[PDB]
Design a protein around this motif. Sequence first.
Motif, PDB file in Angstrom:
ATOM      1  N   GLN A   1       0.862  -1.210   0.000  1.00 19.92           N
ATOM      2  CA  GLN A   1       0.000   0.000   0.000  1.00 19.92           C
ATOM      3  C   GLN A   1       0.891   1.251   0.000  1.00 19.92           C
ATOM      4  O   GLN A   1       0.482   2.262  -0.601  1.00 19.92           O
ATOM      5  N   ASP A   2       2.057   1.219   0.668  1.00 21.64           N
ATOM      6  CA  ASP A   2       2.948   2.416   0.682  1.00 21.64           C
ATOM      7  C   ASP A   2       3.399   2.741  -0.741  1.00 21.64           C
ATOM      8  O   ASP A   2       3.417   3.950  -1.100  1.00 21.64           O
ATOM      9  N   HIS A   3       3.697   1.724  -1.548  1.00 22.67           N
ATOM     10  CA  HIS A   3       4.064   1.912  -2.982  1.00 22.67           C
ATOM     11  C   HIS A   3       2.890   2.577  -3.719  1.00 22.67           C
ATOM     12  O   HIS A   3       3.106   3.524  -4.511  1.00 22.67           O
ATOM     13  N   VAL A   4       1.678   2.090  -3.494  1.00 24.24           N
ATOM     14  CA  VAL A   4       0.457   2.655  -4.124  1.00 24.24           C
ATOM     15  C   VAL A   4       0.370   4.131  -3.739  1.00 24.24           C
ATOM     16  O   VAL A   4       0.138   4.966  -4.626  1.00 24.24           O
ATOM     17  N   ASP A   5       0.580   4.448  -2.462  1.00 24.92           N
ATOM     18  CA  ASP A   5       0.462   5.838  -1.954  1.00 24.92           C
ATOM     19  C   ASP A   5       1.527   6.700  -2.635  1.00 24.92           C
ATOM     20  O   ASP A   5       1.203   7.828  -3.046  1.00 24.92           O
ATOM     21  N   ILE A   6       2.755   6.190  -2.728  1.00 27.90           N
ATOM     22  CA  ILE A   6       3.901   6.926  -3.326  1.00 27.90           C
ATOM     23  C   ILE A   6       3.599   7.221  -4.800  1.00 27.90           C
ATOM     24  O   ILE A   6       3.990   8.295  -5.275  1.00 27.90           O
ATOM     25  N   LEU A   7       2.892   6.321  -5.485  1.00 32.18           N
ATOM     26  CA  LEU A   7       2.494   6.471  -6.913  1.00 32.18           C
ATOM     27  C   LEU A   7       1.279   7.402  -7.056  1.00 32.18           C
ATOM     28  O   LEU A   7       0.891   7.717  -8.221  1.00 32.18           O
ATOM     29  N   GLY A   8       0.739   7.902  -5.940  1.00 33.91           N
ATOM     30  CA  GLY A   8      -0.437   8.783  -5.898  1.00 33.91           C
ATOM     31  C   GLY A   8      -0.356   9.944  -6.889  1.00 33.91           C
ATOM     32  O   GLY A   8      -1.243  10.120  -7.729  1.00 33.91           O
TER      33      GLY A   8
END
Lengths: 301, 301
Positions: free
Chosen positions: B244-251
Amino acid sequence: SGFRKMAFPSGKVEGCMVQVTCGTTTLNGLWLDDVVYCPRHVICTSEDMLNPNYEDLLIRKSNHNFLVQAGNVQLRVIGHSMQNCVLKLKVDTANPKTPKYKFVRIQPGQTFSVLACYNGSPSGVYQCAMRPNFTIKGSFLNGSCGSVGFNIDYDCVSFCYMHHMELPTGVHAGTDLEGNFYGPFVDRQTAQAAGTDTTITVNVLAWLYAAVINGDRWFLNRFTTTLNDFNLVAMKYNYEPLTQDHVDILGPLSAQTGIAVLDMCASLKELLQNGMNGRTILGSALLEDEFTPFDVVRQCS
Amino acid sequence: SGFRKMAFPSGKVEGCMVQVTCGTTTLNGLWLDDVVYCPRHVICTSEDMLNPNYEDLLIRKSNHNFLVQAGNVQLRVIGHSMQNCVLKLKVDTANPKTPKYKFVRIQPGQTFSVLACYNGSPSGVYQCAMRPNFTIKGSFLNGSCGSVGFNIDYDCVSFCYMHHMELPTGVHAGTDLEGNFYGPFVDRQTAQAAGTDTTITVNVLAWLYAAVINGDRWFLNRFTTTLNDFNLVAMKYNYEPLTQDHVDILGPLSAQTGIAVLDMCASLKELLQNGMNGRTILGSALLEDEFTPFDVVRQCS
């Protein structure tokens, strides 16, 4: 070991980058001795992009209209003149960081380093080749105009490129430092587009030699070809003709690997006809043509 | 437009590079304030590569044994000490070109610029990622040891890497600037080898977003996937798990393109299952994983 797209160290060029502003247009300039070089389109307005008469636009300028900033220090412009598609702004201060330099025009197939800059501030450095169609595949956003391309030999910076524009396919066009465009491009609003491009055959062979020096050998074979039979295949795949001069230039890499140039040509013919069948060369699944024989020798020694 | 593997401007680092010679070993040092940092293996001889006791080798050294050269100017060594796998040579002169700097250790998946140097002289600059296996795929010949990797934030140089060695596969290993190796490598003669590596999934997604920003859209589809179903496919193709942190960083890249991260994940799943069917993305026929989300945002703005 290893083989990377490698730029020249950019420090000598960083010390020459300044910001040039006319009205609401800001772009980069190159400050060498007491002259700042920048794209003449800095003097354009939105309301004259179709057929700007740059001689008229420049006649209507005063030195005080040009705001030149070297870091947090304003340079006083004391003269302005046009040089083809570049402006020469004479300033009252010689750049103390001026390196030994030359203005050289490169050939299609040659490489150089780009120092991409915005607001006179360097952001990044990367290698480009001058394509056969006189475009470069760079990375440039609005504000990047006046960023320069260069090579360094010993202590001497050979400036070869100044950025002016992006063409509709997302490729880039600009001038030499005498303000002469590479290729059939103009600093005026037209439907101008990149012409058909070709693959730089001598560079692909140089990169196959780099691969061999770095231990990729899977594409080698016992076959040799003639230069004539090779060129028949090259033409078919939109590769540039290979000349005897290209063979001669590949001499040292041939000597170092013990692989004859026309032997390496038989490998390239097989790669063009069959593809890589799921293998890679130096981390690429494509045949790479933006390394010159010189780039390979410099890096692989 | 355009998307290039782009290094930081190297000038701030060029001004720190020096040559360090012990006996017949020459390599590079990093000169910051009145300290020169270099690989401790400069004090090794051919006759003690198996199990060198560096504490013993250093005890037997004198300041005068270390020849430190900053261009054509010899620096007098006035102190020597060991810091893990790096040597700290105190010199009687503070480097006047010392930039604002930090010593930062990076994570696997992060990128940095390498200034490859020989005999204290910069030769070229290129980007590297720290692989999941703590190696880097660089370009380094004998003499390159002490070359450094770095990032620049505003005016501050964050040094993250110093080059020590080449592993048998042609990949590279070294330390942070506190002398602590990245990964399970030692500065002594062993059969040490790179461990199994994986693909940096978050970086591949960042590069797909770069491709979209630059107008490559052919790999897009109407499908979305779950993070769980995506990770089942990633594991199968030796890709790192996406968090999920990767998903957030790709925000931000998601916001800019209007393409949801799990929508882009459905594209990646299709590319892993089917390949590119003869197409390319940003001039590559492979899925590229050495650009971070930050690299894409920085370059594509």
